[PDB]
Amino acid sequence: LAKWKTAEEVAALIRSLPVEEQPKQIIVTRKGMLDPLEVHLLDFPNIVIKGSELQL
Amino acid sequence: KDGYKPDVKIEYVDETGRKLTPKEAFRQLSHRFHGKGSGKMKTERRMKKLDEEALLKKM
Amino acid sequence: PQSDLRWSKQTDVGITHFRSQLIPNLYRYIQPWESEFIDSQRVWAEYALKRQEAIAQNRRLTLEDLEDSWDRGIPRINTLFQKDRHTLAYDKGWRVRTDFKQYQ
Amino acid sequence: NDRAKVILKPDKTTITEPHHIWPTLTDEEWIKVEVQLKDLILADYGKKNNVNVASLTQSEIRDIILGMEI
Amino acid sequence: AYAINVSQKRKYRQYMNRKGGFNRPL
Amino acid sequence: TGIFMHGKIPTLKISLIQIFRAHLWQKIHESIVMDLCQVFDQELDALEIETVQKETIHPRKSYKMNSSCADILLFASYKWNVSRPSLLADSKDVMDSTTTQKYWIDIQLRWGDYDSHDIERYARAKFLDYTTDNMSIYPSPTGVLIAIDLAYNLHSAYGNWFPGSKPLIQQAMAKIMKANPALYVLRERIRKGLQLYSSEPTEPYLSSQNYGELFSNQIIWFV
Secondary structure, eight states: OHHHHHHHHHHHHHHHSOGGGOOSBOOBSSGGGHHHHHHHTTTOTTSBOOBOOSOO | OOOOOOOOOOOOBOTTSOBOOHHHHHHHHHHHHHTOOOOHHHHHHHHHHHHHHHHHHHO | OGGGOOOEEOOTTSOEEOOOOOOOOHHHHSOOHHHHHHHHHHHHHHHHHHHHHHHHTTOOOOSSTTOTTSSOOTTSSOOTTSTTHHHHHHSOOHHHHHHHGGGO | OHHHHHHHOSSTTOOOOTTOSSOOOOHHHHHHHHHHHHHHHHHHHHHHHTSOSSOOOHHHHHHHHHTOOO | OOOOOOOOOOOOOOOSSOOSOSSOOO | OOOOOSSOOHHHHHHHHHHTTTTHHHHHHHHHHHHHHHHHHHSTTTTTOOOEEEOOOOGGGTTOSSSOOOSEEEEEEEEEEOOOBOOTTOOOOOOOSOEEEEEEEEEEEEOOOSSTTOHHHHHHHHHHHHHTOSSOOOSOTTEEEEEEETTTTEEEEOSBOOTTTHHHHHHHHHHHHHHOHHHHHHHHHHHHHTTOOOOOOOOOBOOSSSGGGGGSSSOBOOO
16 A cells, blocks of 8 residues: 555656656666556556666 | 569558557548548647647657 | 368468367366275375485475375375465364355 | 765865755766776675676676666 | 658548438549 | 348347447448558559549448449559459469450458358459459459458458559558558457457666666656
8 A cells, every 4th residue: 555655646746747747758666666657647658667677 | 564572651641741540540531431520629639739749849 | 070170371472271079078087086096095105105215314305306296195186285284284174064064 | 985975075175066965076076086986886896796896897887887686 | 862752642532421422422 | 331140149249230330341441442542553653554543332332242343443554464363362474365454453341250261262252253243343354353351350352463463462452451540440449349458568678778768858757
C-alpha cells in the first residue's frame, strides 16, 4: 500500500506538471515500480516507463 | 514481363501531410464511406490536440 | 480423423500445405494400483536406504540425491522434501477427517 | 565523507552559491575536483574488488560509475 | 536529380448516406 | 458481409455480427480496391498503363457471390498481350496468342472455413466461373480476379496476369496483407472479441551504450 501510494504521488506530481512539460520518458530505478506507475497514470500514456538498470 | 523489382510503397497520409494512424486511417475511411465528417465537439477536440502536439514539437 | 489433421501455411511465395491417429485415453497413463503399491514399497525401501547412507556421513538427503523417484513415492508420491513436513506429520487422523468431511 | 569534502570544496574560500546547493566551480576547478573524485572512486572499486584500482576501460569505468554490476 | 515522393490524395468513394442511386457513381 | 454461416449458432452468429459492426465488409472491400488502385497508379506509367478508373460497381456487388463485376478498369495505351489466365503462385511464363487494350482486375472477399481455406484453388474456380458467368459481365475478358481469405488471413489471385503485372500484383497484395488499414482494423476487432491480446513489447533497458540517449529533447525524470 505504501508503494502504491508513492506511485500515486509520483503520478499526481507529474499531473501537476504541465502536459507541455510532461516527461516523455520515466526512468525508474525500482524494478517493480514500473507496473504501479503505468496503472496509476494509464490516463496519461505519453510517458514511456523505460528501464535504467545502472542505478544512479 | 519487362523485368524489374517493384518500387512500390503506398500509405495513407492526410492532405495536411501527417501520416494518419491505422486507427485514424480506418476512421477516415469509415467517414468517407458513411459520407459524414466530424462534429463540432470532435472538431474542437481535434484542434486542441493538434495545437498541443504542435506546441510540444516546437520545443 | 486423419482426414482433417492437416494444417496450412501462409508462405510469402504462395500457399504451402502441411502434414500430420487416436486421441489417448487414461487407461494406461495412470499406473495400476498393484504396480503403484509395488513401486511405492520399493521407493520407500530405497529412500530409507539413502537417508541412512546420508546419516552415515552425517549429511542431509539432498533433493538431487535419490531423485529418480521424484514423482513416484511411498505414499504414491515422494513428498518428504515438501515444506512443513514436520508440521503436517504431527497432526494425524487425515483419512477419517477427509471421509467424515462429507457430512460437514 | 572526507573525500567528498575535498571534492566539493577543495578551498575553504570556495563554496556553493547562496541561491544554489551543489558547489559551484569553473572548468579548471571542476576538472581538478573530478580528477580527485575519480581517483577516490578507483580506490573504492579496488578495495571492494581486491583488484587493480585503475584497470577498467573508459566504457567500463562509465558503466561502473553508472551502477552496472561489472 | 533525387527521389521525390508526392503521394496523391485518396478520396474514398462514398458508400453510405449517398442519397442517390444504387450503383456507385464514377 | 461475406460470412456465410452454414447453420444457426446464436452465440457464434452474435459474435460474428459484433465483429463486423458498423458496416465493416463493404468499407473493407472499398479500402482494398482503393489501396490496389493507388499502388498501381504509383508506378503505372512505367508499366504501360493509360488510364486507371474504377467501374460503377454496386455496393451489393462486393458481397454477393452469385453476381460479380470488375474492380479496376485500367487502360494500357497499347496492345497488351492477354496472357493465359493462371494462378499468380505459378512461375510458368505462358502467354497465348491473344492481345487487347483494356485490362481488368478484380478483388473478392471470402471468409474461409477449416475446409474452405484453399484460397488458390477456390480463387481459380471463381475466376473460371466468372469468365463464363451469366451475369458477371466484366468488360475485359482478360480480367484477373483476386480473393481475400479474411477468416484465415490469406490472399490469392488466379486470373489473367498481365505481362509484367504479376510481380506488381504480388507485391501489392503482400504489402496490403501486411498493412491493409481496414484489414488491420478488422484483425484488431477480432483479437479484442476473442479475449486475445499479445504481450506488447516493454521499454528496453538503458545499457552503457544508451546511457547518453536520455539527454534528448524527450524529458526524462530519473525516478
